[PDB]
Amino acid sequence: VRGMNTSSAMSAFERMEEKVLMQESRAQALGELAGADLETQFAQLEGGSDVD
Amino acid sequence: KASLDTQSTQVETLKRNLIQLESKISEAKTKKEMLKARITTAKAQEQLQGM
Amino acid sequence: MGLFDRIKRVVSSNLNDLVNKAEDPEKMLEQAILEMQEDLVQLRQGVAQAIAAQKRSEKQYNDAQNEINKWQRNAQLALQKGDENLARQALERKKTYTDTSAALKASLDTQSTQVETLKRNLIQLESKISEAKTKKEMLKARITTAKAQEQLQGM
Amino acid sequence: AQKRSEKQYNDAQNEINKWQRNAQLALQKGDENLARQALERKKTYTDTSAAL
């Protein structure tokens, strides 16, 4: 309940931080790829194709 | 009888606490499984990222 | 605070390394299989011993019943004799023996109920080990599939 | 193992028959407790047999 440093609580904070940062890092890596026009073009093409 | 009542109350409180503790570990286990899934996804993204 | 941080890191690293070294499915299963079988053998022996003990207890109970009959015969003989003391002693002897017999019967009944439960438990245990064995066979089938992929390379 | 399991299953079936005979005997005896015990014994064994 306290959230004070503990054998279980301490481990949980670090792991959660790692999960948040790793996901953010992946997103950061992803956004650069996302920024390029070709990636955007594929999504637009797919939507038209999907509707058909 | 007075001692028994005190013991019973303590036992009931302890049992409730144990159940709460049991619920917490289960949640932690679920969280751990979820955490593992997130880690696996990142590696795959990285592999895709390089190509 | 520094010591605690160091301890957690060391413990996690040591624990992770240790589990991986001993994480072999065949070795762990075999040890587990040996332990349950040994326990089952002990349980079977215990049940047999309990049954033997119950039989021994039954013989003692039977002897008490026989003693009561002898006492009953003596009581009848005592009446013919006309001695008040002999008759009184027989009645007292019969009552304690009867109570003892009843107590023995109750104990035997409880033991009988317990042994039956143990036998049922043993049967359940036998079913459980067989189920574990079945799982290994399924795992073996999966292993063969991996081998088949390798066979493809050879082909 | 299956054959061994089958033998155990067969024994359970035999036990049920013995229990069934006892139940009939219990009715003749007129003791309520013996009859009740037999019925309980038959049900668990039947369930175990079905599971087996």
Gap between the Cα atoms of C25 and C132, Å rounded: 12
User: Which 3 state secondary structure label does DSSP give A8?
Assistant: coil
Determine, for residues B39 and A19 on separate chains, whether the beta-carbon distance falls below 8 Å.
yes
User: Which 3 state secondary structure label does DSSP give A52?
Assistant: coil
- CA C20 to chain centroid: 35
Are residues C21 and C128 in contact, defined by beta-carbon separation less than 8 angstroms? Answer: no
Q: Which residues of C touch A10 (CB under 8 A)?
A: 4-5, 8
Residue ranges of chain C whose CB lies within 8 Å of a chain A CB: 1, 4-5, 8, 12
Are residues C129 and C36 in contact, defined by beta-carbon separation less than 8 angstroms? Answer: yes
Q: Which residues of D touch C134 (CB under 8 A)?
A: 1
Going B1 to B4 to B10 to B11, the CA torsion angle's sign is negative
Report residue A36 as tokens: 């390029």
Comparing CA positions, the residue from C106, C74, C107 lying closest to residue C92 is C74
Q: What is the 3-state secondary structure (H, E, C) of chain C?
A: CHHHHHHHHHHHHHHHHHHHHHCCHHHHHHHHHHHHHHHHHHHHHHHHHHHHHHHHHHHHHHHHHHHHHHHHHHHHHHHHHCCHHHHHHHHHHHHHHHHHHHHHHHHHHHHHHHHHHHHHHHHHHHHHHHHHHHHHHHHHHHHHHHHHHHHHHHC
Gap between the Cα atoms of C13 and C78, Å rounded: 87
CB crowding C116-146: b at 16 or more within 10 Å, else e: eebbbebbebbeeeeeeeeeeeeeeeeeeee
Determine, for residues C124 and D48 on separate chains, whether the beta-carbon distance falls below 8 Å.
yes
Gap between the Cα atoms of A38 and A51, Å rounded: 20
Are residues A22 and B41 in contact, defined by beta-carbon separation less than 8 angstroms? Answer: no
User: Which 3 state secondary structure label does DSSP give B23?
Assistant: helix
Are residues C8 and A10 in contact, defined by beta-carbon separation less than 8 angstroms? Answer: yes
Gap between the Cα atoms of C130 and A40, Å rounded: 57
From the list C126, C133, C134, the residue facing D8 with the nearest CB is C126
Name the residue of chain A whose CA is nearest to C4's CA.
A7
Gap between the Cα atoms of A40 and C80, Å rounded: 120
Report residue C117 as tokens: 């439960």
Gap between the Cα atoms of A34 and C94, Å rounded: 99
Length of chain B: 51
Are residues A11 and C8 in contact, defined by beta-carbon separation less than 8 angstroms? Answer: yes
Cα–Cα distances (Å) from C55 to C21, C26, C46, C61, D19, in that order, read 50, 43, 14, 10, 21
Gap between the Cα atoms of D28 and A33, Å rounded: 87
Q: Which residues of B touch A33 (CB under 8 A)?
A: 49
Cα–Cα distances (Å) from C81 to C49, C84, C98, in that order, read 47, 9, 25
Contacts of C140 (CB under 8 A, 6+ apart): none
Structure-determination technique: cryo-EM
Contacts within 8 Å (CB) and 24+ apart, C24-32: C25/C139, C29/C132, C29/C136, C32/C132
| Residue C36 buriedness (CB in 10 A; 0-12 / 13-18 / 19+) | middle
Gap between the Cα atoms of C10 and C8, Å rounded: 5
| Residue C90 buriedness (CB in 10 A; 0-12 / 13-18 / 19+) | buried
Interface size between C and D, measured as CB pairs under 8 A: 17
Q: Which of A2, A16, A19 to probe the B interface (max B CBs under 10 A)?
A: A19
Comparing CA positions, the residue from D39, D45, D13 lying closest to residue D26 is D39
